[PDB]
A paper describes a structure:
The nsp12 RNA-dependent RNA polymerase possesses some minimal activity on its own6, but the addition of the nsp7 and nsp8 co-factors greatly stimulates polymerase activity. Though additional viral nsp subunits are likely necessary to carry out the full repertoire of replication and transcription activities, the nsp12-nsp7-nsp8 complex so far represents the minimal complex required for nucleotide polymerization. The SARS-CoV RNA-dependent RNA polymerase resembles a cupped right hand with fingers, palm, and thumb subdomains. Although not previously predicted, the SARS-CoV nsp12 contains two metal-binding sites to which we have assigned zinc atoms.
Here we used cryo-electron microscopy (cryo-EM) to determine the 3.1 Å resolution structure of SARS-CoV nsp12 bound to the nsp7 and nsp8 co-factors. In addition to a structurally conserved polymerase domain, this complex provides the first views of a nidovirus-unique nsp12 N-terminal extension that possesses a kinase-like fold and demonstrates an unexpected binding stoichiometry of nsp7 and nsp8 co-factors. Examination of the cryo-EM map revealed density for a single complex of nsp7-nsp8 heterodimer bound to nsp12 resembling previously determined crystal structures. The nsp7-nsp8 heterodimer binds to nsp12 on the polymerase thumb domain facing the NTP entry channel. Binding in this position sandwiches the nsp12 polymerase index finger loop between nsp7-nsp8 and the polymerase thumb domain. The index finger–thumb interaction site also forms the nsp7-nsp8 heterodimer-binding site, with most of the contacts made between nsp12 and nsp7. 98–126 appears to adopt a conformation unique from those previously observed and involves a refolding of loops and a helical region to participate in interactions with nsp12 and precludes an interaction with nsp7. The role of nsp7 and nsp8 heterodimers appears to be the stabilization of nsp12 regions involved in RNA binding while a second subunit of nsp8 also plays a crucial role in polymerase activity possibly by extending the template RNA-binding surface.
Numbering used by the authors:
A (entry chain C): 2 to 71
B (entry chain D): 84 to 192
C (entry chain A): 117 to 895, 907 to 920
D (entry chain B): 77 to 191
The structure:
């Protein structure tokens, strides 16, 4: 599933950018590091662990909550 | 925007990873992380739990289950910033607690 | 008596003919003289300059020893002159404490009438005088490292007397005229000669004394600070001539010159102390530091899903999705600027450089050139940034559509009599890669590119339109072009093998001496339309504009120590002049370093002899020898050169004997010429010419059947084609026309993969065509449109 | 001629704005102290800029560069007016220490004036 995880990472960091995660340099840098480690991954175990941590940024932010409609 | 979120959640459902499904599903009930979910041993995770019905399914004594990992609960603090004991979070005392509660736990190896 | 184990010859050899496996001479010298301990050599890659930069601190511990040898040589030379002794000074007659011995080649003629011959002595030492920081002591009050640093006056900008004092103290017997200020040189050879000394002498002068020189001038009674000259580390001080004070109004042209001139921006800015870098900076133009990020690639889900349904991106397959647009953090742009820390002052063996450049010139002796006027300049990329501050108003169209041709010619003429020290701007690039490293571009300004085209475009266009030559720029791979380029390099080599090599950190470590050499070679066409003074000012402007310019990053101006610029008109060509120079240098060294008496072929044995004697003697250019050496290289070391990418078809029977450069010669040459270590892991060798070069122009080569004959085709790495399909630059989301055009171009590049024995590679082409047919039906491409691209017309 | 006219106006406006900021006593002193009226550009900001910007990537660098209200740089004493972080927020000097180092948006930018 490595190709799907890497493609997902691109979509996920892109929405974090749309939500202005770039505003806080501490958080953006963490988000970029999780993202690039997924893209450079060989082991899907690690790629998923990084995806969990990166996804939690999106789930943590409030107001812009889309998951409620799932 | 809406297109990106549509693709993102569609792709996450297709991956169908248990940790990803657990964090999205908890988030859908109002139970979200406060920080980036830690990956290393004894790293600290903080989450918010909106009610007892959610709490009883994620916490058992001092063990917290989240993102397909166990976490060791160190402390629980309520919405009025008071300390709540684990023995006090139950069906009989719940009506008097300042929910949502913040649950602090470390990754259990 | 009481001489050291090793001689100056062994130190120079060990540093210039460096090979990590056989480096015992160097390791023993460094331990013996306490430059480092023995444990130092257990560090992974202890010898590199890019990784483990600490090696420079270690080589620097030889600097006092090296200057002591230079000073003893001068004292020796005075003594033999007074004694009436005539003779040759060599490095194997001087030990590592600087003591002289065994004067067998020395004879007496008459008291007071002797003369040392030091042309090989100093030239052989020259590359290690900057490597070991030989003049570091001269930064101290008594030229003594045990004492305090010289309290140099910040307002001092000339240093002519100081350079002459150093020259006559260390190189007293170098019997060739030195002109600290290169503006006074008679030809281009005399500029490289003098610049090479300036590189060494300029390292003991303060960093604030170099760069644009300014004066207070008035317009309508209102004072301005403008540049009226420039102090170059390599060229000395160059003053402007067209300096006019108490003018009434400024012309459009004067506004362009002043707007581009940092004197107005830096003198008026904030003082900046930037601790994120080790590079020298001048001023902040803001009160708020700017940071710059790079967003993720735009994922084309429809393409990806389409490909998945066809069997792509499956586990265990040979074709992976490896190429992505990686996001960047805040402090990326500066970490990119900080790689200029690897450009070190580098002194060259001038006797060798002045030979190699003649051979290099022969390689470009079939191209046209000269100066063109403004109305003869072709500019297609008018949507290119005009650079800081011009880019606050518009793109190049804005300036090209404002200035008349007469004004464009006048700006050009200005640069033939003065120097305009422009500002360029660096930016992060959004692009696909297999790596997460930062990538940038250079926003070279309009006040440089507008005049660089008038000076160089005729040549650059001639090179780009010429096929069959060594430097191949602008030659299409299509319609048999790849095949023809390969047959051109293969030529008639007797026992052909193919080689390529890598230039570790090229756009950053390339020294200003080789950058000057390259601009001097490209400027050699200006003989019937440019006098000597004009050729010097044009050099001074190219240097001020792209070697030591001011570079804006974020919100502030930093000084560039050297290297190349991706936004300039000549980089694609100047880099080929360089690639030839390094390849020629490797062949000059490959032959001179071998044992001339172990050569069975009398011809080559005589070539090696005469090569030595055309470098360190016979200073006048021997054009017949140069033609002969050049012909030798054409026959046994056939090169195909593109900007920082080369293929060589060489005669392995000669390379085996050390008569032709091999990869080990390139490794040694790069080590001391560009101060970089080149790993063999990044260099390919191929023995079977049935297959083409492993990689050239980032493409692989295979021989396939076509037309009941055989041809060579290039092919892309399938992981790049699928990555390119999958991620976009966010411009095709609104117009299917653009989506189709990029997919068709990728489909064409993927075409040769159908000839490949690996079916999974062939499938990328077929994937693209089915996708394109779908796009054309929704909005036709067939396999015939892609097949015709490799069929000669 | 509209393109040329807009460029001409923009350029004149920019250069004159800079001249108003540029013309001062320190500049006259550096030129007057020259042997022939010519000085290096790279020493003007060191002499004429009243304001210094310092960009610091971490706490150890901060402590050895701008510890407390004042610091010395380019042979002048500088007085800190403000510290702004990488998120463009104001940071108090009392907030920059080793314990709170992990909580700041490094690099920090220190603004100081000649004492
Ligand atoms: Zn000269
Ligand atoms: Zn000319």
């Amino acid at each position: 599933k490595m190709s799907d995880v890497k493609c997902t990472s691109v979509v996920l960091l892109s929405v974090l950018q749309q939500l202005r995660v770039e505003s806080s340099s501490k958080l953006w840098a963490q988000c970029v590091q999780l993202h690039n480690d997924i893209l450079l991954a060989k082991d899907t175990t690690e790629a998923f662990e990084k995806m969990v941590s990166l996804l939690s940024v999106l789930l943590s932010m409030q107001g812009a909550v889309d998951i409620n409609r799932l | 925007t809406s297109a990106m979120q549509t693709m993102l959640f569609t792709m996450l459902r297709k991956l169908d990873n248990d940790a990803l499904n657990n964090i999205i599903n908890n988030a859908r009930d109002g139970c979200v992380p406060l920080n980036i979910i830690p990956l290393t041993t004894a790293a600290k995770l903080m989450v918010v739990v909106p009610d007892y019905g959610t709490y009883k399914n994620t916490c058992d004594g001092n063990t917290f289950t989240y993102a397909s990992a166990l976490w060791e609960i160190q402390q629980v603090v309520d919405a009025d910033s008071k300390i709540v004991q684990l023995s006090e979070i139950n069906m009989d005392n719940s009506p008097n607690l300042a929910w949502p509660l913040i649950v602090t736990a470390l990754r259990a190896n | 008596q009481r001489l050291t184990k090793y001689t100056m010859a062994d130190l120079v050899y060990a540093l210039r003919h460096f090979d990590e496996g056989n480096c015992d001479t160097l390791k023993e010298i460094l331990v013996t003289y306490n430059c480092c301990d023995d444990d130092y050599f257990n560090k992974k890659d202890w010898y590199d300059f890019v990784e483990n930069p600490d090696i420079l601190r270690v080589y620097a511990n030889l600097g006092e020893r090296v200057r002591q040898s230079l000073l003893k040589t001068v004292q020796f030379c005075d003594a033999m002159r007074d004694a009436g002794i005539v003779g040759v000074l060599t490095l194997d007659n001087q030990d590592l404490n600087g003591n002289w011995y065994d004067f067998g080649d020395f004879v007496q003629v008459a008291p007071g009438c002797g003369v040392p011959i030091v042309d090989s002595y100093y030239s052989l030492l020259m590359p290690i005088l900057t490597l070991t920081r030989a003049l570091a002591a001269e930064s101290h009050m008594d030229a003594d490292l045990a004492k305090p640093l010289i309290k140099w006056d910040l307002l001092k900008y000339d240093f002519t007397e100081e350079r002459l004092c150093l020259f006559d103290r260390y190189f007293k017997y170098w019997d060739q005229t030195y002109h600290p200020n290169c503006i006074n040189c008679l030809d281009d050879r005399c500029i490289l000669h003098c610049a090479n000394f300036n590189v060494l002498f300029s390292t003991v002068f303060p960093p604030t004394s170099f760069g644009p020189l300014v004066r207070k001038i008035f317009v309508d009674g209102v004072p301005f600070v403008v540049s009226t000259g420039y102090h170059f580390r390599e060229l000395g001080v160059v003053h402007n001539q067209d300096v006019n004070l108490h003018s009434s109004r400024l012309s459009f042209k004067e506004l362009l010159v002043y707007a581009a001139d940092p004197a107005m921006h830096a003198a008026s800015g904030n003082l900046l102390l930037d601790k994120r870098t080790t590079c020298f900076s001048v001023a902040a133009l803001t009160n708020n530091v700017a940071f710059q990020t790079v967003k993720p690639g735009n994922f084309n889900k429809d393409f990806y899903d389409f490909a998945v349904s066809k069997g792509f991106f499956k586990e265990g397959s040979s074709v992976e999705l490896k190429h992505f647009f990686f996001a960047q953090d805040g402090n990326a742009a500066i970490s990119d600027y900080d790689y200029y820390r690897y450009n070190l002052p580098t002194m060259c063996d001038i006797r060798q450089l002045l030979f190699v450049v003649e051979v290099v010139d022969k390689y470009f002796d079939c191209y046209d050139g000269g100066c063109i006027n403004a109305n003869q300049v072709i500019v297609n990329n008018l949507d290119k940034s005009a650079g800081f501050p011009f880019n606050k108003w518009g793109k190049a169209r804005l300036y090209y559509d404002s200035m008349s041709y007469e004004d464009q010619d006048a700006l050009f003429a200005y640069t033939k009599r003065n120097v305009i020290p422009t500002i360029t701007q660096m930016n992060l690039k959004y692009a696909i890669s297999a790596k997460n490293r930062a990538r940038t571009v250079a926003g070279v300004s309009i006040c440089s590119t507008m005049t660089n085209r008038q000076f160089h475009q005729k040549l650059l266009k001639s090179i780009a339109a010429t096929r069959g030559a060594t430097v191949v720029i602008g030659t299409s791979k299509f319609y048999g072009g790849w095949h023809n380029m390969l047959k051109t390099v293969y030529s008639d080599v007797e026992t052909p093998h193919l080689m390529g090599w890598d230039y570790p950190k090229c756009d950053r470590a390339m020294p200003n001496m080789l950058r000057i050499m390259a601009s001097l070679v490209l400027a050699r066409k200006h003989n019937t339309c440019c006098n000597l003074s004009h050729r010097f000012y044009r050099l001074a402007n190219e240097c001020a504009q792209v070697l030591s310019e001011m570079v804006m990053c974020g919100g502030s101006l930093y000084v560039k120590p050297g290297g190349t610029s991706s936004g300039d008109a000549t980089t694609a060509y100047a880099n080929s002049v360089f690639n030839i120079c390094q390849a020629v240098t490797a062949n000059v060294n490959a032959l001179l370093s071998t044992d001339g008496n172990k050569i069975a072929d009398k011809y080559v044995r005589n070539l090696q002899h005469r090569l030595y004697e055309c470098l360190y003697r016979n200073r006048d250019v021997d054009h017949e020898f140069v033609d002969e050496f050049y012909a030798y290289l054409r026959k046994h070391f056939s090169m195909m050169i593109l900007s920082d990418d080369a293929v060589v078809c060489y005669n392995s029977n000669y390379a085996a004997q050390g008569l032709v450069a091999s990869i080990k010669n390139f490794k040694a040459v790069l080590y001391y010429q560009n101060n970089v270590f080149m790993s063999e892991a990044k260099c390919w060798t191929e023995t079977d010419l049935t297959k083409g070069p492993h990689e050239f122009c980032s493409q692989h080569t295979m021989l396939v059947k076509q037309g009941d004959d055989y041809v060579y085709l290039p092919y892309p790495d399938p992981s790049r084609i699928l990555g390119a399909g999958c991620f976009v630059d966010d411009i095709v989301k609104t117009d299917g026309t653009l989506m189709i055009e990029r997919f068709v171009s990728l489909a064409i590049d993927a075409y040769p993969l159908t000839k490949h024995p690996n079916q999974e590679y062939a499938d990328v082409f077929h994937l693209y065509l089915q996708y394109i047919r779908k796009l054309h039906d929704e909005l036709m491409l067939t396999n015939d449109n892609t097949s015709r691209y490799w069929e000669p017309e």
